């Protein structure tokens, strides 16, 4: 480790920690809250974007004086990715649009994007490349989303095999998507078991995985301890809400399952306290008119 990479002082706001983070994605939800905790930790975050600079201005007040830095890339080139991973201590891969644009399918994003970036990450000699994945990403049918993420898991396990694959369950938070669709109403009767996981325990597990070794190679899972039914969750979310570009891959996901795998360790083995969904659901169940 080079000089001025060593940690210093109390935490946060110029605490030059032992990581130099390079985050892919982060214009959306989970990567933005991850950069939020990194600026709480006080490291330098290299993040690219191909979007309008609003969200990267939005995450500007996060780090300290001139810490975070921004660049550009696209799903065509190699030079910009290499320029992003020129000098990176740790590097994470969040990517994926939940609907089909006219040029990026569900195909070839999870196939073409983690291959090139993870390959040049191994070719940059980085340590602890982390890649996300959904829970129960199976080759089994009725899930384009999960089978493409399973192909992504296969590619990341093929090139640089000791990369940290992280799989949580569905993530409830402050700007959630599936729980927004739960709230997005105005007659249907079904059932499928399901348990979600809270976003800040997820990202505390992420930073513990990114700075606590013995973690590489073996994939990790992050599930909340709920383990109940979809119908009870619909009753719960509508009792708290007090009410009486979308595809049906969404409804396939929320009627798939949430099954466990005892092969891999989780929350308590990695050492971060799991919080249930009660008061955070009270947070994220706003918009109602006069019951507060």
């Amino acid at each position: 480790l080079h000089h001025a990479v060593i940690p210093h002082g109390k935490g946060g706001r110029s605490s030059v920690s032992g990581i130099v983070a390079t985050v892919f994605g982060a214009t959306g939800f989970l990567g933005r809250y991850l950069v939020n905790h990194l600026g709480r930790m006080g490291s330098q975050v290299i993040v690219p974007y191909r979007c309008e600079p609003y969200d990267t201005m939005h995450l500007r007040p996060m780090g300290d004086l001139g810490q975070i830095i921004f660049m550009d890339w696209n799903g065509r080139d190699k030079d910009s990715i290499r320029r992003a991973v020129e000098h990176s201590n740790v590097v994470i891969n969040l990517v994926g649009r939940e609907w089909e644009t006219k040029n990026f399918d569900f195909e070839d994003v999870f196939v073409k994007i983690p291959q090139a970036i993870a390959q040049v990450s191994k070719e940059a000699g980085v340590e602890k490349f982390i890649h996300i994945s959904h829970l129960n990403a199976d080759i089994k049918s009725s899930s384009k989303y999960l089978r493409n993420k399973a192909v992504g898991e296969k590619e990341v396990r093929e090139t640089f095999p000791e990369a940290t694959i992280i799989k949580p369950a569905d993530i409830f938070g402050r700007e959630d998507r599936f729980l927004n669709y739960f709230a997005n109403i105005r007659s249907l009767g079904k059932k499928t078991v399901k348990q979600p996981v809270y976003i800040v325990d997820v990202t505390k597990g992420i930073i513990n995985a990114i700075k606590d070794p013995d973690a590489r190679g073996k994939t990790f899972a992050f599930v909340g301890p709920n383990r109940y039914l979809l119908f009870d969750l619909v009753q719960y979310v509508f009792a708290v809400a007090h009410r009486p570009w979308t595809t049906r891959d969404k409804v396939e996901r929320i009627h798939t399952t949430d099954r466990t795998l005892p092969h891999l360790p989780g929350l308590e083995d990695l050492g971060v306290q799991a919080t249930p969904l009660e008061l955070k659901a009270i947070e994220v169940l706003r918009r109602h008119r006069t019951y507060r």
């Binding site: 940690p7 109390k10 008061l279 947070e283």
Partner: protein, 114 residues
């Protein structure tokens, strides 16, 4: 040191005024946590109130106990009004970690610390 008093002549009215303060804080929690639209149960806020009373166990002098009662009464004025806000009440809570350690081993690895 025949000091002028503040409110109490001995520890009796000191304990009486601070238990009246704690009575007011117990009956002060639910109105404010329903009004200010917080994210926290009533029992957790009441437990931080009794924890903040538990912090000051070593306070002995009647001037100092009366001055703590004066600070608590001023803050209960500023919280029965909405001069303060949600930011201040969530600043009484310590939620955004800061998980800063106490073990000598963790004061040693994450070091330059006593």
């Amino acid at each position: 040191t025949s000091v002028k008093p503040i409110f109490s002549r001995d520890m009796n009215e000191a304990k009486r005024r601070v238990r009246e303060l704690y009575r007011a804080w117990y009956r002060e929690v639910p109105n404010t946590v329903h009004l200010f639209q917080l994210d926290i149960s009533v029992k957790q806020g009441r437990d931080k109130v009794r924890e903040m009373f538990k912090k000051n166990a070593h306070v002995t002098d009647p001037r100092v106990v009366d001055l703590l009662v004066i600070k608590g009464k001023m803050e209960l004025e500023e919280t029965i009004n909405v001069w303060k806000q949600r930011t201040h009440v969530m600043r009484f809570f310590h939620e955004t970690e800061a998980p800063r350690p106490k073990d000598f081993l963790s004061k040693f690895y994450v070091g330059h610390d006593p």
